[PDB]
Nucleic acid binder design. Structure first.
Lengths: 37, 185, 43, 48
RNA sequence: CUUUUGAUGUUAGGGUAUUGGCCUAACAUGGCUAUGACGGGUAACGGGGAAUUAGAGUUCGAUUCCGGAGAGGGAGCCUGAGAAAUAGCUACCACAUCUAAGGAAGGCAGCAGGCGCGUAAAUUACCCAAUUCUAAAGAAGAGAGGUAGUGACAAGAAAUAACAAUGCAAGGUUUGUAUUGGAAUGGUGGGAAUUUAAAACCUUCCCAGAGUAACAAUUGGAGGGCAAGUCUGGUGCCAGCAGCCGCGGUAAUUCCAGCUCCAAUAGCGUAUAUUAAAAUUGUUGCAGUUAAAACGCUCGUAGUUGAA
RNA sequence: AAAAACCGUAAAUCCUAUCUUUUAAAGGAAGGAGAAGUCGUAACAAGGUUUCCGUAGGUGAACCUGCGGAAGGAUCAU
């Protein structure tokens, strides 16, 4: 959701690494779109 | 296209259908006054609630107010004609002081058995259905009828009821008996 | 899937009629019966 | 209104343990697929 | 955003019934805009209204009537006071009819009915007797309209018993609780008066016409919300039920059944839409440290409130 | 009167571009649910290296490190 993420009581992943992996996906998706279009 | 005749409901749905105390009080009242079903008491609730709402909307108005001194006098006069509020009752709080047995006292089935005629409340009900009554000059058969204070004065049997001097009794029984008597004679 | 068991309990349940019994009362009769059964006799 | 096509069992939530007789239907109003659970224990065979 | 194709205005003119960028020529460069224009959507004809209300409100408004538009979808046109009319005409396409093959004529979104669509909607009936219209205006037409027919769209009234004895319980000679048995009336069959343009229905009367009043009222449940069963059979993680929680592996209080009982009653279930519940859209009335939530911080125009 | 032109109203056909709505598509890359599958100790205690944030790089994955922060810390304290 918004900036009130993490709050790890739920025992989930680390939001920082989640963001890192999501940004890597963003980068490769942008590379694919540039190659295609 | 559409016919120009107005039409609207009479009985409102109580909501919350399973309250033990309200249901048992309804049972007590239905036993007391011998009506046929819950819808009738619901519509009586509607009528009483509408009267009370009118009373509130008239009480909210000021003193020497034309709207109150007109609409309220009309409503109290109608209630007096109905006989709900007596001579000593004259004010708006007394108007609000209506109650379910007070309103049910005026019905035909209660009135006829209160004054006599029948032996049971439901006996009076079935007699009203079998149309042996007359309000004076007119025969009625709807138990939900409401009489007036001067209308009670001349309630009695119907003119054409067999009890009242019409065709005496069972045609089948009497005719078989007279056949038997004539053949034996 | 093993869909060849639908209605198994329905098929294996035995069969009974509803007997004769009395014609259940209607109108004001049921209400009067219930009222006299639930206020006058009990104490 | 739709047309019954095929019959496939569907499982349930983990705490429960049973099978549900669900049937897929092809609609004629739109032309889509849906899955519907048939009520009644014997009604699975009561349908063509 | 608009402005070569009139956008905004001035001057003059054509045109119309009058006025006007309505249009023509010249001249000017103007008009709208976070008080949201220009655009896009609307499973959007507008209004008095309808649903719900403590009061605020939110939602539906094709739909008795007022106004607008249309008659396949654009275009045009005569007559006529008044039509850009469609049961008037012309032309195109898409349809489609008859056709001796050469050629003709077409618009049911009028009253009925057919096809197709979809869950979804009534008779190819009667009559202008009521309203009111048209004309050369009493005597003729009027699928405007009234009546009849189908009609559990909705709404209102009310039958499916009551009463006397006995026995039972309860009680100080009162209520209900199976036996007897006769009074009473609807339902129905019929005949009539009235009724209506005719016919029907109601209304009123007269014969037949109720005891198991065989002239019978059911739908849905009985673990909790939720009123009512650890009552009795069959099944045993299966079939299943269950709006949510949930029950079912041998006593199933929850499944399939019989009894009893329950809510409603000629009515109740199923689903979707929708309102209240919602003080979970909060103007009166929400919350923001930790549950969802005060921008990183400040200046700042429009807006908003402002000493006495 | 047929017939003809003219400014004009302008039907209808096609081309061009744009917009709006559904749909195909080899493969790629996500999410969810399912079932006792496979690999690990990541997190909850000082979780066995305190945890978390912002950012850059790296690893089979949970992750790790570097820099500057926060205590929601394991300290309210010579």
């Amino acid at each position: 959701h918004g900036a009130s993420r993490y709050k790890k009581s739920r025992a989930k992943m680390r939001w920082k690494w989640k963001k890192k992996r999501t940004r890597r996906l963003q980068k490769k998706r942008r590379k694919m779109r540039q190659r295609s279009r | 296209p559409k016919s120009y005749r107005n039409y609207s409901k009479t009985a409102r749905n109580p909501k919350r259908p399973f309250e033990k105390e309200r249901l048992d009080q309804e049972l007590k009242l239905i036993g007391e006054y011998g009506l046929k079903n819950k819808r009738e008491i619901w519509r009586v609730q509607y009528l009483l609630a509408k009267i009370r709402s009118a009373a509130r909307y008239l009480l909210t108005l000021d003193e020497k107010s034309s709207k109150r001194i007109f609409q309220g006098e009309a409503l109290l006069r109608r209630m007096v004609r109905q006989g709900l509020l007596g001579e000593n009752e004259e004010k708006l709080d007394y108007v609000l002081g209506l109650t379910l047995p007070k309103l049910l006292e005026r019905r035909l089935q209660t009135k006829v058995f209160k004054l006599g005629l029948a032996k049971s409340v439901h006996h009076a009900r079935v007699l009203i259905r079998q149309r042996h009554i007359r309000v004076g000059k007119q025969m009625v058969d709807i138990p939900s009828f409401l009489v007036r204070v001067d209308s009670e004065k001349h309630i009695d049997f119907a003119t054409t009821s067999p009890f009242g001097g019409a065709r005496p009794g069972r045609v089948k029984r009497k005719s078989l008996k007279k056949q038997k008597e004539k053949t034996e004679a | 899937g093993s869909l060849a068991r639908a209605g198994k309990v329905k098929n294996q349940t035995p069969k009974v009629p509803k007997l004769d019994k009395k014609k259940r009362l209607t109108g004001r009769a049921k209400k009067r019966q219930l009222y006299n059964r639930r206020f006058s006799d009990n104490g | 209104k739709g047309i019954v096509v095929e019959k496939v069992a569907i499982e349930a939530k983990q705490p429960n343990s049973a099978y549900r007789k669900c049937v897929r239907v092809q609609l004629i109003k739109n032309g889509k697929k849906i899955t519907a659970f048939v009520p009644g224990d014997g009604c699975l065979n009561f349908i063509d």
